[PDB]
C-alpha cells in the first residue's frame, strides 16, 4: 500500500491474522466454566483440552478432544470465562 499505520490497525485484520504474525503474538484460545446436570461442582476448562475432562464428584463426562477446539457433551451449560 506504500503508506499505512502498522501500530493501530483494525481488530478485524488482527483477528483475521494468525496468532503470531500480528504486532504482538497472543493466544486465540479461551477458558470456560461448565456445569453438568446433577452435581453442580462447576468446573474450569480449556478450549483446546487434549483430554477427556470429567467432574470430580461424578465421572460423567464434560468434554472430549479433537485436533482443534474440544467437543463438549450435549447437555452441559458453559460460560466463557
Amino acid at each position: 500500500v506504500l503508506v499505512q499505520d502498522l501500530l493501530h490497525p483494525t481488530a478485524a485484520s488482527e483477528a483475521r491474522k494468525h496468532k503470531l504474525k500480528t504486532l504482538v503474538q497472543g493466544p486465540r484460545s479461551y477458558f470456560l466454566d461448565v456445569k453438568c446436570p446433577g452435581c453442580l461442582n462447576i468446573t474450569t476448562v480449556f478450549s483446546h483440552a487434549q483430554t477427556a475432562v470429567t467432574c470430580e464428584s461424578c465421572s460423567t463426562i464434560l468434554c472430549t478432544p479433537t485436533g482443534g477446539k474440544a467437543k463438549l457433551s450435549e447437555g452441559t451449560s458453559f460460560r466463557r470465562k
Binding site: L2, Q4, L6, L23, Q25
Partner: protein, 129 residues
C-alpha cells in the same frame, strides 16, 4: 540461521525505501539496532521510530522519508584503526563529503567523523547514505 538481526533489519529497510514505502516493520529489536537508528535519525535519514515491547525480544516500527539510498552492514564486524577508517570510507562511500560509516568503539556507537573528533577507533559494523 538468523545471526545478524542487524543485517536483516537494514536489508528490510533498503527494500522498503526501494519500494518507496514510508514505514517498515522490524524484528527483533536489539540495542545496537536502536543506537544505529538513533544515529541515522539524528542525521536525518529516516524520521521517527517506535519500540514495541512484546515480552519476547521487541519489535520496531520506523517511519521513513526518502533521504536514504543504502543503509548497509559489514559482516564480519571488522577491527579498525585510525587510518583504516579513512581507507574504509574511501572504499565504501560515494564521496568525501557525505555518507557515514558506523563503528562500535569503547566509547559507544557513533559515526566516523565523530570518532575522528574523539580520536578513538574500534569495530566497524556498517554504513549508511
Amino acid at each position: 540461521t538468523r545471526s545478524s538481526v542487524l543485517a536483516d533489519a537494514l536489508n528490510a529497510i533498503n527494500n522498503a525505501e526501494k519500494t518507496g514505502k514510508r514505514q517498515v516493520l522490524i524484528r527483533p529489536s536489539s540495542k545496537v539496532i536502536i543506537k544505529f537508528l538513533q544515529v541515522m535519525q539524528k542525521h536525518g535519514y529516516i524520521g521517527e521510530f517506535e519500540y514495541i515491547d512484546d515480552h519476547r525480544s521487541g519489535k520496531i516500527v520506523v517511519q521513513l522519508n526518502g533521504r536514504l539510498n543504502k543503509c548497509g552492514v559489514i559482516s564480519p564486524r571488522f577491527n579498525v584503526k585510525i587510518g583504516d577508517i579513512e581507507k574504509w570510507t574511501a572504499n565504501l562511500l560515494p564521496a568525501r563529503q557525505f555518507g557515514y560509516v558506523i563503528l562500535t568503539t569503547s566509547a559507544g556507537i557513533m559515526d566516523h567523523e565523530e570518532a575522528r573528533r574523539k580520536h578513538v577507533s574500534g569495530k566497524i559494523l556498517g554504513f549508511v547514505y
